[PDB]
Amino acid sequence: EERKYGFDTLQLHAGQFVDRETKSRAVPIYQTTSYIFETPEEAADLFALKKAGNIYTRIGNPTTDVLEKRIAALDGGVGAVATSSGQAAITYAILNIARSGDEVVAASTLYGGTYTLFAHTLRKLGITVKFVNPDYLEEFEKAITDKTKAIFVETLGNPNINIPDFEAIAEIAHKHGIPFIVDNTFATPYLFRPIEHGADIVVYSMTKFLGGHGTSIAGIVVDSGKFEWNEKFPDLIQPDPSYHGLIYTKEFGNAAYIAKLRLTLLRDIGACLSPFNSFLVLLGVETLSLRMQKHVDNAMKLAKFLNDHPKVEWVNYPALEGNKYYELYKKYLPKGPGAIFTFGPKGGYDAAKKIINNVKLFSHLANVGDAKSLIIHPASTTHQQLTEEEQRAAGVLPEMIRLSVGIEDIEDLIYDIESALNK
Amino acid sequence: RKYGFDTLQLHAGQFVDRETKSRAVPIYQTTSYIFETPEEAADLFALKKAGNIYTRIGNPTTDVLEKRIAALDGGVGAVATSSGQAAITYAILNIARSGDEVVAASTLYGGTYTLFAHTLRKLGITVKFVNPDYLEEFEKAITDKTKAIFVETLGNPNINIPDFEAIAEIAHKHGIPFIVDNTFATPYLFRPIEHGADIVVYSMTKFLGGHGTSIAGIVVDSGKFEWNEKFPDLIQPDPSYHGLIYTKEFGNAAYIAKLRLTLLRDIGACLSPFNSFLVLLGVETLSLRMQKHVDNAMKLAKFLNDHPKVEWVNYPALEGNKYYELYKKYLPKGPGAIFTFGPKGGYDAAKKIINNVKLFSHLANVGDAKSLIIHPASTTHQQLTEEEQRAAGVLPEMIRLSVGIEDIEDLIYDIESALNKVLE
Amino acid sequence: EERKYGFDTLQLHAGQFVDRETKSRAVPIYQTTSYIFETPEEAADLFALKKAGNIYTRIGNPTTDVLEKRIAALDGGVGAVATSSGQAAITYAILNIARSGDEVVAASTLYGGTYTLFAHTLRKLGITVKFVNPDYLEEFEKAITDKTKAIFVETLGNPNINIPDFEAIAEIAHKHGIPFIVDNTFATPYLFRPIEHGADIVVYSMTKFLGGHGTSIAGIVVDSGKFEWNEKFPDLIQPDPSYHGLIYTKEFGNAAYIAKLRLTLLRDIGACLSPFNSFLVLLGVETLSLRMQKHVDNAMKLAKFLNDHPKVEWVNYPALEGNKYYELYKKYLPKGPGAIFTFGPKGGYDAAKKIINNVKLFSHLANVGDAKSLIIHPASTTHQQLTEEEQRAAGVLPEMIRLSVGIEDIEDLIYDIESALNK
Amino acid sequence: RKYGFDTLQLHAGQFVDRETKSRAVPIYQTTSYIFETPEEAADLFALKKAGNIYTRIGNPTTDVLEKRIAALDGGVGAVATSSGQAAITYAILNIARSGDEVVAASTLYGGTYTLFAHTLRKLGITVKFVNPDYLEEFEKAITDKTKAIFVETLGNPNINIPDFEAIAEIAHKHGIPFIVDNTFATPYLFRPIEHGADIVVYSMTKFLGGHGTSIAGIVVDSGKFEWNEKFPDLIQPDPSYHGLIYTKEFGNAAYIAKLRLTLLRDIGACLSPFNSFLVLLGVETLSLRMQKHVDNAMKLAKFLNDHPKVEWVNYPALEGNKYYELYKKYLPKGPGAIFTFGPKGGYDAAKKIINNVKLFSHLANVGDAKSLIIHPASTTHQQLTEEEQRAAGVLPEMIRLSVGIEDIEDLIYDIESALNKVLE
Ligand code: NA
Ligand code: NA
Ligand code: NA
Ligand code: NA
């Protein structure tokens, strides 16, 4: 009769077992490549997948395992695989179910890096990502073909801060027998558990809020385990010749996708996470709810402040009255639609430049989801790779300042942004 | 006036940071870097200015290691990756897209083989495995889709030494780069770029890192390969960078620039700055470790080669080894520190030995300071078919030793004691 | 006209400057022993203290410097020196102003380790620590002699959870021209800034709440800079022969004590903190307010829960109605008297053993101030070194369970402790 | 059947953790460790049971390093500390209380000298500095309060080699331990315990760690010293442990047990598990690095010893060096890799050289892989009076080189180029 722990317990404990050797309370940093095999048979068994155990950190690492289990536990997934980066998580999440010739439907409202991965890198690997305006559920529907393997959206458009109608998009995905992949980087499980809202697979840049401290690039893929792998995902339901005819759904049941992702993509492409990074991201995850609550409390107040400020044209934050995504925010992200939002100063690009140049507390850097408040001009930075049209479709605007509202004293954030605005 | 290898392994790429004057390479365990101005942020993203943008793309700790490996290999630049697998993936994906082919030696690390045969196959990249013993096979396998020839310096675990220069001439004849996975040699024992490689990849996990702590890969660009129409993504405007042409913007660093700006940035198989730091600590002693590794490997290989309980020992430096002359030509300091042997009594004896060694670590790795042992057929190359294993030089009785820097007398004793427990 | 940032901003930003080299937003881990000297003159200048700069990590490290400045900024001190441990902080805090033949007055209500340091280790170095019942201000007064160099108390007795009357004890210390040293480990600057309440010197086990994640042993000494070093502290006001007649108060002004502590004790005894530890403790400090707020919110609810529980004899938490320290809690620790408190089950030692043995979420380990909830029986563990009398005086009791209430879901903590109590 | 040094430096103290089977030593960056039961917690605190209690007291990563250094030195045990200074402090404070004396060579690292002369003096410990050249001075300085003789293996920066065995006989005659700070040699070059040391201390910061990353110290207990009435705290009930007698509970490990249980626990100059991890990575290559260090040092010392712009070179392995025979006797592999030289043109030339070297790192450290240079009189020993500096063998013109593992040709070139810039 196992205990159902709360989020705040899970973010601290989940996936974390006291190692039998040292009884270390902290998750050891298993900064190891390798692990002893007690016997040839055990080694053969580990590689044959006949026995669970550590083989090689590229495949699996006991530090990272904590983080994987922890995020899976927070999202309510069966499993997760940490990656070297959000981008690697996204890459893996797609490549796990999409091969050359396959298609993915993605919101156009993506982080520039995902957009580029989708538009360019995956394109070159024969994966055609069809970008849809996520505001138009029919566009998901229209873009799906026999070749579509997934719908991919961000919980909160980097940096459109649009909230896809997850359950509606999930319905579309599931109607077509394809998984719904939600990049939940902007929300974290604390603000949004996409699995509860139809996501089959959640990915994160753990770089951002999950890690929370701007220290560690990291990604993770969380498998809901909810998705029935069908004939559109032959590699999940057919003998994998690289594992002597292992069938992921047969061997791993509902964990097929995440098992495959580890056994195929993590192992083969090796976008593995450093155990050190895992450890640092774990230290972030330990305070995730606390951070995220402060982040969203601050984001609300900063967004409300900017929303009423006479030198600000607009503020794009779902929680602001009259935001297009307000009701989606209330439905899906009731704790607050993340802590990243955009605003357009009066004076446009030139005012934006001046603001970004005159904030002293906001950190002008390429990141979101640091405990520290971050500012950037997506058009020239995060989404610089996108064509004007792709930027436009990603919700990028020339005057747009993106704020990742940190957990600083809101009064300081307001003061900082106010002082910058008054210059 | 160039610094010697031993100096470079300690110093190359490592600058005293202007802030702290740290002698050690700081662990810049950061995601992000301040942009002084919106103009600077724009310039950085527009590649108008060098600087730190985001650790997925580049990191000053990792930069040291990249520059250092690039310096040791005599490459223009390098990009570190989360793993050797990612380095290999990136090395290929940088220049191969769906529809493309790569010619690879069959004598690969199982994981590379599997990446090539399966994962890349799913990305529309057909790796054609050739028998690297036969230069004609490289030539034969090349098509107008081939984008590279890929070999390991010393096949994991065949310990074959491709005829690098001859293979390089084939690649180059075909206007394709020769990629050498130099994991087993490190630049100390072999600098593939001096022998026709255009691109070197390492699992820095192995000897470069040397301590079994850190998964890491790197791709080193020789800078020598003239990217041609077979690599449009290097010589044609990149729509992801507003029609940047890598060869135009980066000259000889086109490949490695692209690899960072496209694959590292997009797929994000980035190395942890901490891993970079640890690998650096390995690299600092690379020549010392590798010299000891090879001194030990030779002794152990000689010991086992003479041993009444050992059927065979496969190490190029052993008299009569097929690859002996290639070892003399290409790895004169010693053909790495990994070799295989087959005990008399075959697989069963192999298991007894692996079970009986106390000092050798039974684990999946090579190129630890620690002596490692494994049975590749059931582990490292377990994913391969019998045929693939055979083509990879994996044999059922085969024990792979990664000869560490322990006291050779202990390693000999350990293996001797284990052997001397297997009945005649 | 520099900005007065809030606590939450400071815990994130204070002491942290973007390095000119890399512009890293995260505090680099300057895991270096050494630092380049541009010139013999610069090296000579650094060692002669004619120039600030990095010399050697044992003395100073730019990662640790952030943490030092940050804690100094949170406490409102002029400076801090991080140490390898709380114990080293305490050792240094004392040895910086007390030599063989000198005395210190300390509350008997100490962490066993401090008690032992005081009672034994310092005794052997000719420093006689006179232990007073801190409930009796007259006892501080009585125990002070010509030889007394300091009064030392914990903000919240480990594990008595007594609150000394800081300002009253400060008055006694200052009346005798000796500094008041407050071990603020249990509170952190978030709950209590001893410098605002008469402490001249604050020490912490940063191991505990400041670090917050149970990863890193670390201590720090924070100098208020408020204390006028007088003839009782010759080494602060007279030429230091180890620095060619440097006078700390002359060279360092109000930072004399902390400067000396670095230049003499840190340098000479070298209880220095790893830059890595500094980095990890910084990651804790970044969420300090958030953690501490959750900790105290949980501690209150758990203490209130245990305080009403029919299998609990007593709960010692200042914030519980009728606790002796309630008004001291309201005066000094209004945000909550830390998140560590003790309770005596009914059934005494035997029930305590059973509880400690049957908690599944509480971690039975020697630490406090982890994000994770911790449990231990001080009498047999943290204070095991103390004689029955010293334990008694430290507020240790045979039936006493000490809880470090973590930031888990209070419902889980309650459930855990309730389930343990019902066994 | 003992493992060789090279094996021990890689393996000693390192066990495969039962949980993960990590080959690498995990970084147990933990404060705390679960007690399975209140009984277990009680037993651990009551020292009825070995196990992990709290990282200030003991840590499984650090344990590896402690055991490893203890293994390399042939000690019973070791306790790592935050620094060499803390190791020295602990080594002394473990056996000296206020009122006690220590006899130390004057030829000390400035920081030790200063700890001894000032910090310990404030704790009522009178360190009597003797001229280690003259065995009689050790004898003369000993009083019934002396608790130890303390010397460095190779004086920082006098590079004098005490006559360890002769000094050990003096200490032992007086029933006091001989503590050798073996920082400059490491167990690879000198195992003081084999030459009469009872306690060895290191700055692991230096050669043991070898990479300039991590401040660390260790105290190694030979286990050989029979604690007597001059050490009541080792042979009398410890009131802090309910009358535990260290010699009774820990036998030959009394000292090192006490040091952990009293000084480490109470003063908490504990090493970061991360530092332990990094130092371990150094130690893994200790023999390799130290061999290269000494090979390089000899070459550099010979180069400078023959150099027309160098007045003197102080390195025991140089023909005519006062300590040559002691080098032959005690450090036959080479008297460490730190030496001094005085350029012709004295201090001014010294500054020119220090300013002019490009490869040598001007910084305060020794025993980095990197070659280091400094002017001790103005840096490392700056805190000492002229007299103390002189008694420490510090000279105004003196340049201390910590000869790294760079290519000797680069180091020679670097110093040659710098010298050849100083006018005759
Ligand atoms: Na600016
Ligand atoms: Na076995
Ligand atoms: Na139990
Ligand atoms: Na200079």
Side-chain angles (χ1 to χ4, degrees), chain B residues 116-133:
Chain B
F116 281 3
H118 295 295
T119 292
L120 288 197
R121 171 178 57 77
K122 283 162 182 185
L123 302 181
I125 300 168
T126 301
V127 179
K128 276 129 169 242
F129 298 99
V130 299
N131 186 333
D133 282 352

Side-chain angles (χ1 to χ4, degrees), chain C residues 55-170 172-256:
Chain C
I55 294 176
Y56 189 74
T57 286
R58 196 206 318 128
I59 297 169
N61 171 275
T63 303
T64 302
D65 183 70
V66 174
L67 178 49
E68 285 167 344
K69 288 185 176 164
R70 178 153 306 173
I71 302 309
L74 291 182
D75 259 324
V78 61
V81 172
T83 62
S84 45
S85 67
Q87 287 297 120
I90 292 170
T91 299
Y92 275 3
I94 298 308
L95 294 189
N96 201 38
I97 52 172
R99 72 157 62 195
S100 186
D102 296 340
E103 298 185 352
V104 169
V105 169
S108 67
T109 55
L110 297 173
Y111 164 54
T114 309
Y115 186 85
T116 306
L117 169 63
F118 283 2
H120 294 299
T121 287
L122 288 191
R123 179 181 48 83
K124 283 169 198 177
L125 309 173
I127 298 165
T128 308
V129 179
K130 282 175 85 219
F131 296 94
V132 297
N133 188 334
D135 293 341
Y136 295 102
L137 286 168
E138 59 262 66
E139 286 195 34
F140 289 96
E141 182 55 49
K142 276 175 235 294
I144 292 158
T145 70
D146 296 0
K147 300 190 170 166
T148 310
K149 298 303 182 179
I151 302 181
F152 179 102
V153 308
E154 292 177 6
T155 297
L156 289 148
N158 192 346
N160 190 217
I161 334 292
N162 64 309
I163 305 166
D165 190 338
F166 303 96
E167 292 176 13
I169 298 159
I172 293 167
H174 295 156
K175 156 175 193 190
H176 287 280
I178 69 177
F180 181 35
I181 307 176
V182 173
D183 180 342
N184 196 40
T185 295
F186 271 28
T188 85
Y190 179 63
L191 295 185
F192 186 60
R193 284 176 297 283
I195 295 179
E196 298 182 12
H197 298 289
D200 299 300
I201 298 152
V202 182
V203 301
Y204 297 92
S205 176
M206 301 197 292
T207 308
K208 315 293 175 55
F209 284 108
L210 280 173
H213 299 275
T215 66
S216 304
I217 306 293
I220 192 164
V221 180
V222 181
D223 184 1
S224 66
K226 284 195 154 52
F227 189 81
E228 269 189 48
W229 299 109
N230 58 45
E231 298 293 341
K232 289 187 181 191
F233 306 96
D235 296 335
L236 281 168
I237 66 167
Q238 292 177 1
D240 183 337
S242 67
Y243 282 100
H244 297 303
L246 170 72
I247 298 163
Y248 291 99
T249 52
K250 186 159 163 298
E251 180 64 6
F252 296 110
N254 61 18

Side-chain angles (χ1 to χ4, degrees), chain B residues 88 102-118 127-135 137-139 141 148-163 167 178-179 181 184 322-323 376 380-385 387-395 398:
Chain B
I88 292 167
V102 170
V103 168
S106 60
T107 54
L108 300 173
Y109 168 53
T112 305
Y113 195 96
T114 298
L115 166 67
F116 281 3
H118 295 295
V127 179
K128 276 129 169 242
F129 298 99
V130 299
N131 186 333
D133 282 352
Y134 302 113
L135 289 170
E137 288 307 302
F138 285 96
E139 172 59 50
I149 302 184
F150 182 102
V151 307
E152 290 171 9
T153 299
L154 290 143
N156 182 355
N158 190 214
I159 330 298
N160 60 309
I161 306 171
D163 192 338
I167 297 165
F178 178 36
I179 305 175
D181 177 344
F184 273 26
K322 195 187 320 167
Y323 298 105
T380 65
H381 288 68
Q382 181 264 357
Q383 288 193 280
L384 272 56
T385 63
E387 293 81 350
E388 292 170 342
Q389 282 193 355
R390 198 143 39 235
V394 176
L395 291 161
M398 159 179 288

Side-chain angles (χ1 to χ4, degrees), chain B residues 5 126 138 149 160 173 193 203 235 294 308 318 330 365 397 415 417:
Chain B
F5 192 97
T126 301
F138 285 96
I149 302 184
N160 60 309
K173 178 148 261 164
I193 292 171
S203 178
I235 64 159
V294 300
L318 288 175
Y330 289 119
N365 197 26
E397 71 272 30
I415 200 75
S417 185

